[PDB]
Amino acid sequence: QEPGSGIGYPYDNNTLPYVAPGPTDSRAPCPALNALANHGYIPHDGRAISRETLQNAFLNHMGIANSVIELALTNAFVVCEYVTGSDCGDSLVNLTLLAEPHAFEHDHSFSRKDYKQGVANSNDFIDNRNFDAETFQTSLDVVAGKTHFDYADMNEIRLQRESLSNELDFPGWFTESKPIQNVESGFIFALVSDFNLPDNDENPLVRIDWWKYWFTNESFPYHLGWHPPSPAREIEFVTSASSAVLAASVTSTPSSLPSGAIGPGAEAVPLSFASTMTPFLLATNAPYYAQDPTLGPND
């Protein structure tokens, strides 16, 4: 928000306004990175981004501690080298390359289509990067009519997404990614669980309106009473949440789940790509921005 607005105070005392991305700006498949870039906490153009820029942006503007993004930073830079064909040093070339498929970006996302979702021909691909309202609605529908949801509900959401993606993706494309997705499950609980409830740290419940605002608008739900978690969330909370989601009892089982879907997941680890492997072409679509309604500087 505008620095003088005081909207972030006393949690963020140095805010910057929302600015929609333009057609030449680079955006990510990540709702967090996109919100940060929209506010210029990382470059508005989404290019040439250092590790410390990311660390400071998450810590000071989203209440996400450095520990939470340690692996994510490692993996962003691995993917940058893989996509561009050279070491990116400490300047992430852009945000868009993070949508390189079957890498950091993965199938069965909560709010993005898959790279080969619903394509008639094997060589074809689609926008697996920009926010997709219909896809997000498939996630939200699992918790329809509710204001909050718990670990068991999140487990049902990711199962629904896995089922739909396994059915809809071009045959042979779909690849399950429980470890990376469920770190992101933990990220959702870390950012938009309801800290106004007495037992939030131990038994976090996602506020659906906060989640929907963050994903749809790629800006922060201050108007709904959200603020950056204080103290900043640490990696322990995230991986504990991740484990809790996957441990939760499944009471409704979708059909067409991949083998072993129900059950614990492997620890997320650094990515690696063979030097022989050429990257998949990136979707070239202009960056998404909210238009129903468009957002003001304080939204």
Ligand code: HEM
């Ligand atoms: C340098 C730090 C980060 C990097 C490089 C990064 C990168 C990515 C990438 C490549 C994806 C796409 C995965 C997919 O859905 O296919 C993604 C998704 C996601 N990210 Fe980030 N991320 C970072 C930090 C964070 C943080 C701190 C949060 C929240 C606390 C967050 C929230 C999410 C969520 C919820 C998704 C899933 C979106 C969906 O499934 O529709 N990210 N991120």
Ligand SMILES: *[C@@H]1O[C@H](CO)[C@@H](O[C@@H]2O[C@H](CO)[C@@H](O[C@@H]3O[C@H](CO)[C@@H](O)[C@H](O)[C@@H]3O)[C@H](O)[C@H]2NC(C)=O)[C@H](O)[C@H]1NC(C)=O
């Ligand atoms: C973010 O950075 C990535 C990585 O540099 C950009 O993707 C790459 O964009 C270049 C065009 O600048 C593509 O190069 C072209 O490739 C074709 C076919 O290989 C070739 O015939 C052309 O002569 C040219 O070299 C490259 O393919 C593409 N990389 C991938 C894996 O898709 C991306 O455009 C950047 N996005 C933004 C919004 O800045």
Ligand SMILES: *[C@H]1O[C@H](CO)[C@@H](O)[C@H](O)[C@@H]1O[C@H]1O[C@H](CO)[C@@H](O)[C@H](O)[C@@H]1O
């Ligand atoms: C991205 O751009 C490529 C050429 O620049 C196209 O070949 C791709 O199909 C893809 O097109 C989509 O996004 C661009 C914006 O860069 C639009 O101009 C297209 O209409 C399409 O939505």
Ligand SMILES: *[C@@H]1O[C@H](CO)[C@@H](O)[C@H](O)[C@H]1NC(C)=O
């Ligand atoms: C914001 O400023 C107030 C008043 O000086 C201060 O008490 C508070 O700690 C500040 N918040 C942060 C995150 O520094």
Ligand SMILES: *[C@@H]1O[C@H](CO)[C@@H](O)[C@H](O)[C@H]1NC(C)=O
């Ligand atoms: C997006 O932000 C606008 C402006 O604050 C708000 O009116 C709208 O409800 C938000 N969208 C969602 C889905 O929360």
Ligand SMILES: *[C@H]1O[C@H](CO)[C@@H](O)[C@H](O)[C@@H]1O
């Ligand atoms: C989440 O899981 C990690 C291991 O992946 C632990 O280090 C952390 O304490 C939490 O249990």
Ligand SMILES: *[C@H]1O[C@H](CO)[C@@H](O)[C@H](O)[C@@H]1O
């Ligand atoms: C790890 O931490 C999470 C979040 O605090 C808990 O919900 C979980 O029960 C475990 O203690």
Ligand SMILES: *[C@H]1O[C@H](CO)[C@@H](O)[C@H](O)[C@@H]1O
């Ligand atoms: C990972 O951690 C979660 C949260 O404590 C557990 O529920 C799960 O059994 C696994 O050990």
Ligand SMILES: *[C@H]1O[C@H](CO)[C@@H](O)[C@H](O)[C@@H]1O
């Ligand atoms: C069984 O219970 C789970 C978790 O409580 C729900 O998510 C599911 O919809 C079913 O009712």
Ligand SMILES: *[C@H]1O[C@H](CO)[C@@H](O)[C@H](O)[C@@H]1O
């Ligand atoms: C749906 O069905 C699966 C196995 O078919 C169970 O693992 C799950 O708990 C739910 O009953």
Ligand SMILES: *[C@H]1O[C@H](CO)[C@@H](O)[C@H](O)[C@@H]1O
């Ligand atoms: C229980 O919930 C699952 C996942 O949301 C569905 O696949 C199933 O049809 C039932 O509604």
Ligand SMILES: *[C@H]1O[C@H](CO)[C@@H](O)[C@H](O)[C@@H]1O
């Ligand atoms: C979230 O984190 C937990 C604990 O490391 C994993 O079990 C899960 O697969 C996901 O990566």
Ligand SMILES: *[C@H]1O[C@H](CO)[C@@H](O)[C@H](O)[C@@H]1O
């Ligand atoms: C990471 O691991 C892969 C193996 O999948 C290697 O190809 C790569 O060079 C790096 O060591």
Ligand SMILES: *[C@H]1O[C@H](CO)[C@@H](O)[C@H](O)[C@@H]1O
């Ligand atoms: C990268 O590009 C090569 C051609 O140089 C393909 O063979 C490969 O499958 C990938 O698209």
Ligand SMILES: *[C@H]1O[C@H](CO)[C@@H](O)[C@H](O)[C@@H]1O
């Ligand atoms: C986004 O832009 C529209 C104009 O199309 C305004 O009506 C709105 O207030 C927001 O700034």
Ligand SMILES: [Br-]
């Ligand atoms: Br670029």
